[PDB]
């Protein structure tokens, strides 16, 4: 990799040439973009991170993971943020939808699961996968799954001049993690994973725990919030869901839940459901945005939906010109290819009947007997790793980080991934999404320990 000063540190950024396919290491090529601060003491190596989602940029979060970097780190390693293949500044990167795509869905309430509705949003997925295929054209969206980005991080510890890997992961960037762990177990110089995805899992019964651990953080951000003056939710937070939903409902018309009623707002779009339950779900991330979840709630007691269409937005990565990145778009690819989908349409009705029983507040109306098929029940190219309890015998103990009530990645998750790993847990005790080098000098420390020393946390440690 040939670097150079790039367009906030003394950051520099290179490009690396991987193969699309790794059967035909001489057909199509893919370029990684990357990220690096180099470190102000004496080396040990690159700390490489990963942000998750899939789609989220490597270089974005380590521009930011740089500003609560422990001094001690910053000595010892390099700190290195990359785009994964289809990703952000990586070429070719996955797209999908226009601008204009995203806003005509998010407009929708979406809401509508009567034979119809179920039809009509099979239609925009259909129209979707169409526009994925078109554009990136089938070869290349057979091969971003996770179990190709395993093999250029491979590449990149390579390229960066380091004989073992030093790995950072948060979320989705923890199947990264125990994925180059089963297929380089002997090039882990060590790994922290923070927000655990179980590879393990069966995908109904892990989308049925996250929408548990969003209705818990929900009821976490309401019991704070009824303590507080003026809580929009009421005083009373056995009540919170159903004063909730006369608050969003009413963005639906009553007659027909096909039809958007938004909230005014000063952007054009106004506030529609959809939008409305995005932004609460984003807010649920982090008590940092509890406070924002709780003006916009205060703003719908008056018709308006300004804070809670901004907080869609952050979630949407959609700017303030109307421009999205194309995490939305490689999201979808990636989780495509990770895992064999659902098909089976019983079982997806069946899921969201008992949806609706766990996370009330993110469920409208009522069971109507029909619910859509995912995205991925229609993906055209086949799964390129499917559920399997990760095993990876030779591999250097590593950290599992997680919280007690995690709404995305939830604690048991963790628990059973740091089973698997036969590594350490470390449990942070709190309501959000991640929680390594944002804030808790405990945490940091253990981290840092383990980062340079090798030291892990003791059996039962708590933050």
């Known amino acids: ?55 989220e940029s490597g270089i974005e979060a380590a521009l930011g993971v740089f500003q609560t970097l ?18 952000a500044s990586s070429r070719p990167a996955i797209w999908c ?68 890997l030093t790995y950072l992961g948060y979320s989705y960037g923890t199947r990264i993690g125990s994925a180059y762990a089963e297929e380089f177990p002997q090039r882990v110089r060590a790994m922290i994973l923070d927000g655990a995805v179980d590879p393990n899992a069966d995908p109904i019964e892990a989308e049925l725990r996250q929408a548990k651990g969003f209705q818990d953080a929900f009821n976490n951000y309401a019991a704070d919030c009824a303590k507080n003056a003026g809580c929009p939710l009421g005083a009373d937070p056995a009540k919170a869901v159903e004063v909730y939903h006369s608050l969003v409902d009413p963005l639906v018309d009553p007659d027909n839940p096909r039809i958007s009623r938004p909230a005014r707002t000063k952007d054009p779009r106004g506030l529609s459901y959809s939008d409305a339950i995005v932004g609460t779900i984003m807010a649920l991330y982090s008590p ?7 003006d916009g709630l205060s703003e719908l007691v008056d018709n308006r939906g300004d804070t809670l269409l901004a907080l869609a937005d952050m979630y949407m990565r959609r700017d303030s010109h109307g421009r999205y990145n194309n995490s939305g778009d490689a999201r979808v690819a990636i989780n495509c290819v990770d895992q064999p989908p659902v098909t089976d349409r019983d079982k997806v009705i069946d899921e969201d009947r008992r949806a609706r029983e766990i996370a009330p507040f993110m469920s409208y109306g009522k069971f109507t007997g029909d619910a859509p098929l995912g995205t991925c029940a229609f993906w055209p190219v086949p799964p390129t790793s499917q559920p399997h309890a990760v095993s990876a015998p030779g591999l250097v103990p590593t950290v599992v980080v997680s919280t007690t009530h995690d709404p995305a990645t939830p604690y048991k998750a963790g628990v059973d991934l740091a089973n ?7 449990t942070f005790d709190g309501t959000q999404h991640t929680v390594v080098f944002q804030g808790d000098s405990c945490i940091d420390e253990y981290v840092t320990a383990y980062l340079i020393g090798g030291t892990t946390p003791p059996s039962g440690a708590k933050c």
């Open 288 to 294: 940092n945005l509890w406070q924002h979840l709780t």
């Open 70 to 87: 422990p001094k001690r780190v910053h000595e010892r390693f390099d700190l290195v943020g990359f785009d994964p293949r289809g990703v």
């Open 1 to 55: 990799v040939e670097w150079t000063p790039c367009r906030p540190g003394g950051a520099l950024c290179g490009k690396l040439a991987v193969p699309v396919d790794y059967d035909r290491p001489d057909g199509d090529v893919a370029a990684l973009a990357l990220i690096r601060f180099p470190a102000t003491g004496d080396k040990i190596g690159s700390l490489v991170i990963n942000p998750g989602g899939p789609g």
């Open 420 to 426: 698997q790993l036969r590594g350490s847990l470390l």
């Open 97 to 164: 939808n226009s601008d204009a795509d995203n806003d005509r869905l998010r407009a929708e309430p979406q809401v509508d699961y009567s034979r119809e509705g179920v039809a009509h949003i099979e239609n925009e997925t259909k129209q979707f996968v169409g526009r994925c295929v078109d554009k990136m054209g089938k070869n290349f969206l057979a091969h971003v799954g996770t179990v190709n980005v395993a093999k250029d991080l491979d590449a990149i510890r390579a390229a960066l001049g380091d004989d073992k």
